[PDB]
Symmetry: D2
Subunit: 456 residues, 4 copies
């Protein structure tokens, strides 16, 4: 009697998926040294390694790409992108960059100095790389609830105001800025509340500090505020977006997420000092100030995607697919970081491969098993990703050990989601049989997960 | 434990769907005079009016379009298309046309003369137009089982050999050729067996007549032979395709169906007499002999699509979506032409709007109701489409009265299919309440369904 | 001191040109039986066989194609095209067709009956085919000056009002309409004056007859009115366009010319009787009334191209290239139809191959020689194209014998134009050596030039 | 009698050019503070500010873009690009980056340490930025002839072997590698001979040093070797390309030049130590090792462009346009860096605005004048670009003071080139009238030319 949900868009172009045998996968995963980053695209059946830059654009984004201005200085495509951003966020100063880590690279080489601490909620791992690489400290202040995977709360990505107050009371003198990541990617794609953004703003104001939003998934965050925060049920995504950024002094964004483009990023800010200070590094690292390592056609696609993905229906379609996957997982009893976030499901490996020693890397082992089972490639957000202690050279076994299933936007159907959950069900139903994980054979000094070799 | 089915492709580009209120639809269906062909695209939520030319192309088809040769004579794109066709069918003579009815127009103005009878299984309605328009008779010889909607048989589209033998014994002298439509579109997208194609070939051979295949959905037909005809379980689609056309003297094809292109068609044949006889009409009606009203980029896309859609996985994905829709209909008890065909579900209106007089057009009434309910546009394959008797000026109430739900290829998800079936469920569950249909206000002389005005 | 002219556009995408040896061309022209329509695209170096549908679209046309609505009924792309046409011409009734001869096919099967005469200026050869094919007479009333190739006048394509008055005084009863072709293609792409369009309108009004414009190159015509007709120097192309069509009752158009699209056409009219009378034939020959054998993406490209090519700068760039080619021809003393027209140069073969008997087809011989010389493919607009007398079966040697050099829009540079003129210079400078032309070996009944076989 | 030259390609898509009045330009150049980098694209009529990334791709590059694999790890598009590079250069290790300065950024943060000297021929200015920014010295060893603008020699970009020998004899201990830029961009796009590449290789071998080629225009360089170096007249571009890179240990390339793509770059090398040492910086600055800040569709376009632009005809078409521009300049007596190079004409401002003090920046003044005259935007390669001395804070007035006219590949016609030369003629013919240049109002610390404000 009630019409069931369906996507607010329809398909205009397709591309093939390749299928494979378990015998083929056995040898392919061996030739990759059991590191899925080393698997070839052609060897993956359903690729969930990340939602970054893997999504399908719309017909209006492709039309925008046919109008790209490729001129080196002052392209119409850049002012197009610029005005869209200012319109949507209120920030008047825009620096284009080619991706998110380039925006961090450009901005942090002005703002981050040796010895600084940069507090916030959970820093994404390229973001942490650009802070620690400058001999600064990325200080996690996420609420403790984030590490209770089965605890259900509406805004598990929030910053604990007590934790932030403490760092600033003790080190305000070497705190150059506060960074809030929305949604909170590494805590499992969990949203941050408008209340919490005001909390952060009020504390930053007491200590006269600027606030930076890592904004890769700000649109997913605005959807969660609309759906869960009382007082926002009737506001538009565009309304909630502007309210959010009124509480920030600047943003950095990998547009490869909530722009739904295959490439692109930017810095945007209200502070002339930041704009002027970062300009030099964009010219040296990315390109001239009006393209920043982005094609004209790519900034056009981004301008259109930012406007398109700040509309409710499009966000709703994306996030209900993620929730549908969760629903299937729940149906099979497979534990994950609750409640389902915006962009991915984070399967709690500690509670799936229970017969595998933490020292033998369970989440990485689960990654391998799922790929062997059905050719589905996920990504480990656990012990290997967390790196070794720089002085003790010891592994860090006390954090979450998760298998991330990141969903490229508007690429896979809910039938593919059924295959994912079923393949995961099969692995889960043989847990009392999975007793030895993996062992690092060769290992890099930093961000080893990209390049680590392994056995078994 | 067994992995469920999923599509053998993934999405690369999307476009929006527009939603509407019942109040908007009320006025829009009135301003169309309750003829859905007159509704604007923007006023339809899910468009099932036809699978012809409405499908989504693949990335390799779009790449092929970037290489289109637009030269007026001898484009590389034409020889590309030509060699693909000869390769796949064995026919050496190809005449390009812009669509299917153009291929009929071109070929029948050489072959069809006044007074001829053209027997076959159920002739599609543009095909019938080009025979009757030349004062010839399109004689239906489909097996009688086709009109038993609830009877389940594997090849309900077959030609009855007794019926064909009879016409030829009586009128062989004015029979210019036999036409077999594969799949049988107007009988509900029902397949024709390889056995039946040999039956037709043997009778045509006895009377020394040529055989023409209306081939718009020959690929769907080959899939049904592979899946249902004993002795073909292990043959490739490309194998079955060639076997099929070895039994024909020529083909006519709306490539807008099983080419999965938005435009295109052709004649192909093994008879030099046919090739030479139709050439003049292509130049006069369509264009020069090496493009035939088709862009170079469009013949490239067609060449690629013919090769791509003669592969099992792609056909399987398409046809299981249609079967999934059927499964939902069965779950709600909604009657249709069994078993589900290749491209569409034909809801049996006689058994859904049982409280509506045949004189008040039930299937057309159901079309209107479904659009009012959920904005889904179907198409009436019943009394209105069947036209009036040319001499008696009376409606023909003894044929099937169906609502066709045609599925554009690779456009809608199985979630959209759930919405379709649910919307249809709702209409069905209020059948004891739907007592007056529609009345023709203005009416055309021939093919009135495109242009007919109606009330209530 | 004065800046020289340059194109009002720049290049955004290129494609290759193939070069060849004279030995290769010798065999290729033989395997084509010295009919250049039979040459493969790959065997031509510079293709001037026609400007119809061979042009390069703009970035905004390609963007429009990414937004094409492929729905079968009521596509947004069709109403887009429709409103553009009504805006630009004042005609409210539009019937889409896939090309120009389809628009003639559709409209003349309502308007042209056996025994009618259809007077006008020089009828294009598909247009003449659709009149003579219906057993009607296409009566040329072009001013006699058109056949004086070296006479320079501003509007050599005009209709002689005395000639038109005469036919109507004698046969008004069997004249269904008057047709004016703008520009006058077969008289050498020569314009028609606004004065002459009023002359035609006033005579048609005296006899209460409707006027139809064959409008394939109406934009080139408007440019010539702006540049040569006193009183229009300061009017916009869009202004002149509307004034022109205010004097017509309907138009037929191959948009493959002044739309600068690779496919497309339409009928447009102010007469409901014409609209209603042609509707049935569009459904039977072309497609449903809202696409007419055109892709949605193709009607979008057409909508944009009609607006873009009714702007002065774009027309000026096109036509000055044609004039530049003429300037080079004049520099080498090579005679052509003066003054240069809109879309092509018509070399007067009678005055170039003076040592070749008219019976041995000089213009066709020149076509072959130019291709042998430099791989440039032109087209014969002379004795072969003019056909044999239907009763006497004799060739018609009293008309112009021309080699048309048609320039695809925005495809070739002025450097390619230099190559053309130089290659033609070389042939011309050896005229006292070129003494035997060609002989028809095999010949078709009608429009033999497409399909004629020849020797020497 | 001899056919003149024409382009080996034809046009497939166009985009508009905007025209303007001198009054508009007056205000636009003022609102840019007489810095043309600050002019908006829409305010430029013919944009010659750079050939980097501004060119028009081919139909096969656009087809390749429709097949781009956007997967984050192991995209088919990356191995496509990789194998093309290895095939063409013999280098087996490839690191993708988004542009040229990113490839320098990634590679030099492994190779360049404080106190090093990096000798070579004239270092491009982002390249110099990445050496000097690491507190190293970029030591120019170009032959002295390069600064004699009117001296005509075949390989004016060569490295002086005496100069290179000297640096290595004195500082071999702090020389990490030798860099050869081909063609020599900042010396006026002047080629380097194969002989000179062997000279460099032999000296580097004596001191056991590796050689790096800045390879942005290696294809133009191979064309000049084929056309000017004795012993290479009959070798293919692909042959000369491989011979060239056999003498290098690695390359860095802005593919935005001789790839003819709008974005892209890479490092390629034969040294595993370099590959392994740079990997970490690609992940931190550009992206994962199999896309490096490049779209899949962009690496496909690059793969195709590298193969396409290592073919003689395509290079010949490009470079003869540059030579044609030179020919016109010579015709008007306008001095430039002789002989014309690959990609641009460098007008010698010292010999054009002779009535302007060097302290008032003549080349920058000429830039402004040409833009005022005809809306043509060039770029100053003179005193402003050369920066101030880091300790003395004094301008460096002893180098060349040039106005670079960089030609985007396959964008502008030879008619646009005529406009360029004519506009430059007009400025030149009023030199005895141009007596005051410009004055720095606001000035940046480094690479001031991008961001410098000026007056008069
Ligand atoms: C993806 C990611 C980034 C970095 O963006 P890239 O485009 O991959 O360089 C930054 N922040 C978050 C939260 C991310 O998920
Ligand atoms: C679609 C259809 C046609 C006609 O093709 P068009 O491209 O629409 O002209 C012919 N035969 C069958 C079976 C069809 O379904
Ligand atoms: C091209 C032509 C036509 C016919 O158009 P097509 O698109 O080729 O069918 C009609 N009139 C004129 C003047 C033409 O040049
Ligand atoms: C363009 C240029 C570079 C830098 O490349 P970008 O893509 O602009 O970062 C390096 N070397 C030379 C010779 C250049 O001309």
């Amino acid at each position: 009697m009630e019409l069931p949900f369906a996507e607010s868009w329809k398909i205009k172009m397709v591309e093939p998926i390749r299928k494979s045998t378990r015998e083929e996968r056995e040898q392919w995963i061996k030739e990759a040294h059991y590191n899925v980053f080393q698997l070839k695209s052609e060897q993956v059946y359903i690729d969930l390694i990340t939602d970054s830059g893997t999504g399908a654009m719309s017909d209006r984004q492709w039309a925008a790409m046919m109008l790209g201005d490729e001129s080196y200085a002052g392209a119409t495509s850049f002012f197009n992108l610029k005005n869209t951003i200012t319109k949507l966020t209120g920030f008047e100063y825009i620096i284009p960059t080619h991706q998110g880590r380039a925006a961090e690279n450009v901005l942090f080489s002005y703002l981050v100095h040796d010895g600084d601490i940069v507090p916030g909620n959970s820093h994404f791992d390229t973001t942490k790389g650009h802070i620690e690489g400058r001999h600064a400290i990325a200080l996690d202040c996420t609420i403790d609830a984030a590490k209770d995977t089965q605890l259900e709360i509406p805004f598990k990505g929030n910053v604990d105001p007590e934790k932030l107050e403490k760092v600033l009371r003790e080190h305000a003198d070497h705190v150059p800025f506060i960074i809030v990541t929305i949604t909170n990617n590494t805590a499992g794609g969990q949203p941050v509340s408008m209340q919490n953004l005001r909390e952060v703003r009020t504390i930053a104001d007491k200590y006269n500090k600027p606030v930076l939003f890592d904004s890769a998934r700000f649109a997913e965050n605005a959807y969660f505020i609309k759906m869960r925060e009382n007082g926002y049920q009737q506001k538009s995504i565009k309304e909630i977006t502007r309210e959010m950024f009124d509480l920030a002094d600047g943003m950095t964004m990998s547009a490869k997420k909530d722009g739904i483009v295959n490439m692109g990023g930017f810095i945007a800010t209200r502070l002339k000092e930041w704009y002027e200070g970062a300009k030099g590094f964009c010219v040296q690292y990315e390109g001239y100030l009006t393209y920043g390592g982005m094609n004209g056609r790519d900034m056009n696609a981004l301008a259109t995607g930012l406007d398109e993905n700040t509309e409710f229906d499009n966000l709703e379609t994306r996030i209900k697919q993620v929730e549908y996957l969760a629903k299937k997982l729940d149906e099979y009893g497979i534990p994950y970081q609750r409640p389902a976030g915006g962009h991915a499901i984070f399967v709690d490996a500690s509670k799936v491969l229970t017969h595998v020693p933490k020292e033998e890397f369970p989440a990485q082992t689960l990654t391998v098993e799922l790929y062997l089972e059905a050719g589905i490639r996920g990504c480990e957000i656990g012990y290997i990703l967390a790196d070794r202690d720089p002085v003790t050279h010891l592994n860090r076994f006390n954090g979450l050990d998760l298998l991330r299933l990141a969903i490229p936007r508007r690429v896979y159907t809910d039938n593919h989601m059924n295959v994912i959950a079923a393949a995961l069900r099969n692995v889960y139903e043989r847990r009392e049989s999975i007793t030895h994980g993996v062992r690092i054979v060769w290992e890099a000094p930093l961000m080893r997960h990209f390049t680590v070799q392994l056995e078994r």
